[PDB]
């Protein structure tokens, strides 16, 4: 029934979040990646089948490759919120939890909407980074779409080499918005460059670069 479809959508969102965390450089166990729907219902659903979002929160650490390539990659905390609507209190306590456990990055997935007051305190959570996603837009992994090529975030040395090769200034590169869906998927921060390798019907393969804003 509707409980089954709600559970299925929640499972798909969980899988998408795990894939996103894997793409950004953190380590997710292969068994956890293929964690099927029946196992999800077994672990989350209660006797009446209702799910607990509090049991889905997990932690991840960067792989040695990602840590070597990106030196700013810390620990990641992903938490799903039980409250359908999130306010200043919930965001404040999430910020407290992040600060007390010195997580570098925290992803907070809510259900329906976020109040503007809660949006106001996101930029003041320094040095930790808090990113919020809605449950509805995480059901489908957009980076698996046909029209979406592969985006790879460039390290600082690679960005310097690029700017030296083209004799450029950062304002002269093509831009990508900070609220762009792929930019939020990759957790792009202002001033970072993504390399996009793209299909081309004149040369086969074409590599383009964009800078965040």
């Amino acid at each position: 029934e509707d409980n089954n479809r709600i559970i299925s959508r929640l499972w798909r969102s969980f899988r998408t979040v795990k894939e996103m965390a894997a793409d950004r450089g953190y380590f997710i166990s292969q068994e956890e990646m293929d964690q099927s729907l029946e196992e999800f219902r077994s672990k989350i659903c209660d006797s009446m089948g209702n799910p607990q979002r509090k049991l889905m929160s997990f932690l991840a650490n960067p792989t040695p490759e990602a840590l070597e390539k990106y030196s700013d990659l810390g620990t990641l905390w992903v938490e799903f919120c039980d409250e359908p609507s999130v306010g200043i209190k919930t965001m404040r306590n999430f910020c407290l939890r992040i600060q007390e456990k010195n997580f570098s990055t925290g992803i907070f997935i809510y259900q329906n909407n976020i109040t503007p007051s809660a949006n106001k305190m996101i930029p003041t959570v320094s040095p930790a980074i808090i990113e919020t996603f809605q449950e509805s837009d995480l059901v489908v992994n957009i980076t698996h779409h046909e029209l979406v090529p592969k985006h790879i975030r460039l390290s600082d040395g690679e960005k310097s080499q690029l700017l030296q090769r083209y004799k450029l200034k950062e304002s002269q590169l093509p831009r990508i918005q900070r609220e762009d869906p792929v930019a939020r998927y990759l957790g792009l921060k202002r001033g970072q460059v993504v390399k996009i390798i793209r299909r081309s019907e004149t040369s086969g393969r074409y590599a383009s670069y964009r800078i965040c804003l």
Partner: protein, 257 residues
């Protein structure tokens, strides 16, 4: 699902937007002071069989033909009304074997209030489907796929084409290939899939416009155009509001408009 017509029809029914107004044939308001009985002799049998607040009775007759065509259930409609109105309205519905499919309602000077509530009911009661998708069509697509021997052979598959756009919601419907859903409104593509997908969609639309009459324009020209339109991170329209809002020289900008 692509190679089976029945499952495709099931998906098409599940996607298309259907409201109460679509199946409702007529609506009426009656005065009936007895909640446990009725004045209308035609509906007396059904209400008495069911039985075995305000007096203002609000009833409406559903077209049986379209109700069957939309593959809907009277219980489903009643459940939707109950969910959208909690327990503020007592609802009874005739059985499917009745001569005319009817559903009755009661409130638990109110004639104008009842009329407003009836208008709201006909307005925003959503039965099933993705909002904004007015119509859905079944379309057969010919795709060339390599065979088991490596040879390319044509193949026919079923796909849906809609009227109206809701990309994010339709992409999430189970049974839909979410990795290939496409829209002809690249503003929604920008809002959903990013800027590179917008570039590809914009090129596809431009090529579709140009090549409809058999004309051919080299790829590099359209590539340059769509790279100019999407170089700032957002769609830059070819108008004064797009071109003149750049950082180019004032003398260059003033020569246009």
């Amino acid at each position: 699902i692509a190679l089976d017509i029945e499952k495709a029809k099931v998906i098409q029914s599940s996607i298309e937007y259907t409201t109460l107004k679509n199946v409702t044939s007529a609506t009426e308001i009656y005065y009936d002071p007895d909640p446990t009985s009725t004045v209308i002799e035609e509906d007396f049998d059904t209400v008495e069989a069911y039985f075995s607040q305000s007096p203002w009775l609000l009833r409406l007759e559903l077209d049986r033909a379209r109700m069957l065509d939309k593959q809907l259930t009277m219980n489903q409609v009643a459940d939707k009304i109950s969910e959208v109105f909690s327990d503020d309205l007592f609802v009874m519905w005739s059985e499917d074997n009745a001569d005319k499919l009817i559903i009755r309602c009661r409130v638990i000077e109110e004639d104008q209030m009842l009329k407003r509530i009836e208008a709201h009911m006909l307005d925003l009661i959503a039965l099933r489907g993705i909002p904004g998708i007015s119509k859905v069509y079944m379309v057969k697509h010919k795709v060339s796929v390599p065979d088991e021997s490596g040879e390319y052979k044509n193949e026919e598959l079923w796909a849906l084409e809609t009227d109206g756009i809701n990309l994010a919601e339709v992409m999430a419907v189970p049974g839909v290939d979410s990795s290939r859903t496409y829209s002809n409104s690249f503003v929604e593509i920008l809002s959903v899939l990013g800027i590179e997908a917008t570039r590809s969609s914009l090129y596809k639309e431009i090529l579709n416009v140009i090549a409809f009459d058999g004309s051919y324009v080299n790829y590099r020209h359209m590539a340059l155009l769509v790279d100019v339109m999407t170089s700032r991170g957002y769609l830059m329209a070819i108008t004064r509001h797009g071109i003149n809002r750049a950082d180019t020289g004032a003398l260059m900008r003033c020569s246009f408009e």
